[PDB]
Amino acid sequence: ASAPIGSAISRNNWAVTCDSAQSGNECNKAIDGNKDTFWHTFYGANGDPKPPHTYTIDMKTTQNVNGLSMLPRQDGNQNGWIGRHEVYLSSDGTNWGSPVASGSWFADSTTKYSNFETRPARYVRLVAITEANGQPWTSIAEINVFQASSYTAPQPGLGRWGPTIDLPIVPAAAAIEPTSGRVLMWSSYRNDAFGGSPGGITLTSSWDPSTGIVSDRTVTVTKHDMFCPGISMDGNGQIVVTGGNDAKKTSLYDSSSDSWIPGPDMQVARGYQSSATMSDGRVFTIGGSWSGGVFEKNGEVYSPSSKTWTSLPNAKVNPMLTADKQGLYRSDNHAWLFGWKKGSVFQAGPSTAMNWYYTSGSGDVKSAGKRQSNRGVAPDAMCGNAVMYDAVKGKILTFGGSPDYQDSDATTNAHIITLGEPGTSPNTVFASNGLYFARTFHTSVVLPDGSTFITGGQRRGIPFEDSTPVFTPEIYVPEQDTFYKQNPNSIVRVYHSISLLLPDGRVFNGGGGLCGDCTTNHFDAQIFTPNYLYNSNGNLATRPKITRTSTQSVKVGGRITISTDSSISKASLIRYGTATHTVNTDQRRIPLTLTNNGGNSYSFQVPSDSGVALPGYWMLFVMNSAGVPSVASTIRVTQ
Template sequence: MWLKSTAAILAVVASLAKAQIDRTGWQITSDSFQPGNEPTNAIDASTTSIFHTEWTPVNVPLPHNLTIDMKKSYNINAVSYLPRQDGNSNGNIGQHQIQLSSDGQIWGSPVVIGTYLDDASLKKSSFVTKPARYVRLIAITEAGNRGPWMSAADINVFAAASYTPPQNSLGRWGPTIDFPIVPAAAAIEHDSGKLLGWSSFAANTFSGGPGGMTQTCTYDPASGVVSKRTISNTNHDMFCPGLSIDATGRPVVTGGNNAEKTSIYDVNADAWIAAANMQISRGYQSQATLSDGRIFTIGGSWSGGQGNKNGEVYNTLSNQWALLSGCPVAPMLTNDAQGVYRADNHAWLFGWKNGSVFQAGPSKAMNWYTTATASGSTKPAGLRGTDADAMCGNSVMYDAVNGKILTAGGSPSYQDSDATTNAYVVTIGNVGNTPTVAQVASMQYARSFANGVVLPNGKVFITGGQARPVPFSDNTAVLAPELFDPATGKFTTLNPMAIARTYHSWALLMPDATVYNGGGGLCGTCTTNHFDAEIYSPSYLFNSDGTLAARPKINTISATTITLGSKLTVTTSSAITSFSLIRYGSATHTVNTDQRRIPLVPLSAGTNTYTLTIPNDAGIAIPGSWMLFAMNSAGVPSVAKTILVKSA
């Protein structure tokens, strides 16, 4: 199966390869230039000459642009921008857009938006292949706010050998969002729908740093603006952490490079808060929010010493961590070739009823952990069918009401071992009971380092990964995502993305029902740093002819804060057939423990008015912030409304 998958991977990669286009005969123009720094300097094959917009006698205001006429059409899939190399940073491009055109008159929606890092390194913006003759790079801001300028030492355009139009029924990728950091972790801000990402102490590497700080960025889908800032007040380098969303919707980040630390992002105040240190220093641990609002963590021998990374629990109200002597890490260890350093990494955890946690993997042995007593307890939950250890695979609770979890892929060891195509549905019930495990149809591609996202309709989107996982490599990267349909138990291969998403990548569902897939790398001067994310729009957002589908709208909701078992009245713009709640997610290193979906059955309460009943179980409706989606008979989802579910 691995060989078959590899052949398919190589075919897709070949079709999307990026070849630099010969610039002979190109014409380049700009809205402004300083004599002696003409636009042609950006395509003259010299990195010592520069293009620069006018600064005297007039400081021409931003935005600025460079427009290239390549004289014939190519299958464009990337643009590179080299800032000036003379030691002066004036004119470095910050916020930007890239547009394409066939005729130089009609410009489509940007294929790239975002912000470049303010340094002299080469920037390369990749995107799904599109035929075009003209390329326009627009500078909206100067990266350091030093003046109203745009400059460039060199610009290149890249093309694929062929172009295959995406199939309308298989979703659509784009645009690409450029970030000024390599985001190895990400979370969604529940109050604004903004994407929060972070790397380490530096924008492009995690090693050799001073510790005590983290580079972050925020992307606002409403404005398209990407901003960057350095977080140092918590004295925490938050690379390779445990990560979950607490009962009030705040991302809680633990360990990593500063292995004992806890930092909390206060979404409402847009501020980071230093919290209590963990009892055990950790990195690569997993953590999950519990039915009572506390947070459970276990594992994490990547940092802070190796072995004995037993369970502990955090009380967000008292700001205290407590060890759980009855929750040892030993039952969930894999048989990794690198030993315990890897064997306790990235547990697949699900908060469940009465303060319990179900551990579905990546070890082939599953376990129940309980936290109701001071010591906690552990009970075996059997094997995950015939699956082997599946490190860096995926597990997604796509139907919390019925305890349904999809597990997919992974590899026996963290690296240098073949990933699998294996997929299972694990159904959990009462705490301590042995779950039901059913093998379903395999994925089309073997994957490790992939990411899984549950969609409003209950289908599960699996994206990225490698057939043979190797950190900081994009070899054997899988560019075509797959969609699991619980109704059929099968996977469908979707349109491929443009950028490999392997080690240190993530994927998250957004309130507009799209998926953002980003990151990968964070390895200094390596060639696999990905300062970006791609947006995937599922097929439910389009008509059969590829035009945008008319979306239903949630007009009003009777409350935005609700308790377990309560009823919610919703009015909509048109008839609705189903609703779902999906908990806001946070993701790093393939792990998104708090993500889960609750299908809701609407009762009609009048024309386009519906009553919904929230489950009366905090193990199903884990307290915290959720996205409420409404779907019409065609399966088209609304933009979500945010609901805070409280346990009492």
């Protein structure tokens, strides 16, 4: 199931308007309170005009609208299920602006929702752009519009949430497809559940930021239900998805061809493990006792060149185990892994003990000391997040999480870990005064300016329950060692939520739930627009533009020359992300040192160390004096 975020507006005074309506199926049948009567557009007798079909509501009075719901016809007939759609709001009925929600609803008879940030409106319009099975018609049994108990204008300077992207699935895992700019998402064998899977299948969905189209694809070629996997972008530009519901499987997603290829089985059955791309483009993984048994699950390594997983039994998982009450089932999950120099992987937590993992020979592990500060030893932080916001300087910001996976109070603990050479114990200090809000199951991304955006989570980890939710996201600004609250959102994003940085410099935050009949499934995402995209008026800032790039593919240590339409003060490369279960081992940021060639021509060198400049796809952002980022130019970094 799912749920509206607001409460149903009284429909007694509503006037409704439909592009067409069969007699017996009038526009007002969608607002009569009867699940057995439905509006239906013209068919047969009147011909079959194709979509778009439009449902427009005059609520007569201004309401603080934060959603709609759409109950499909309930007669066992599929005709007119709304697929692609947009929701518009209006104060006058004439000027509709941009959609507050858009995307695609799953093809079934269940109630669908559009949950979105509160916006005072008197008119609400639902456009059915397509029918879920490609037929001419639109039918709605019941349409409802929801209100918050109040409206507060967003605070100026603190970013903006919206629009909502409606989805056919709960995007519990997601990646950017860097060659297309699209957002790839997946659930499990079902759009809303992982429990009861027979294995062998994954439902996926994509969102295209340019076209606004949400599509879907069922993946069976890899014989893999990819719920709760490791995810890494390898040096061959392929997303390596490991284990999970099918605990030994590897699936490979190729962005170029937009296709999935079977990968080799891992040596060890795993779920809830983290995997990390290494300096040589290979992928390391360790832990994961969520599936395939509970026992010591030591490291192993994937080569995209030989297409093999090789066990690294001496890369011991024991040192990175938390003291989780549930034991090994949880204690080896969601390692905060980062590919580093010379085939090493740093494990920053969640366990108090941090560790270096080595991938030469049959593997090794070396204690890197305890995550700590003058405030004390950091406790275990399961589902805390870790973000490498300056790879050049080895800077990792870690935050939140709880000592146990579940039934455990989250904390505001946050640290800055500074990586030096593998085998040395990094410096660790407390980050500012910690998070504003204790949270676990939150998600986070590094932004073009090096700040880290932190969103969602709850104070008390209760998977599948939307309790103690944190609605106010925070941004850590490293230069100021300060966290800033941003404008809050209205949709709970807890267990099974994701966040990714978009090429346009916005954040895509979605998912949560995946519990079948539970009401806490969120079949959506929302866009957060950072303040850096807004000028002092609160309008969208003029963005500097990259008018030419010397190349789209560079070796580590290589130079790229660009031209811009205006002078730029700062530049960054941000490695494209992947996300599930709080884990994102793919994103990282490199601050670029720019050579001003004059004439708005600039050059920079990609770091020569591939442990820093992890091979794969990266976003180049350039920022003007005003600190407004360009949209990203995609750069492939190779060895």
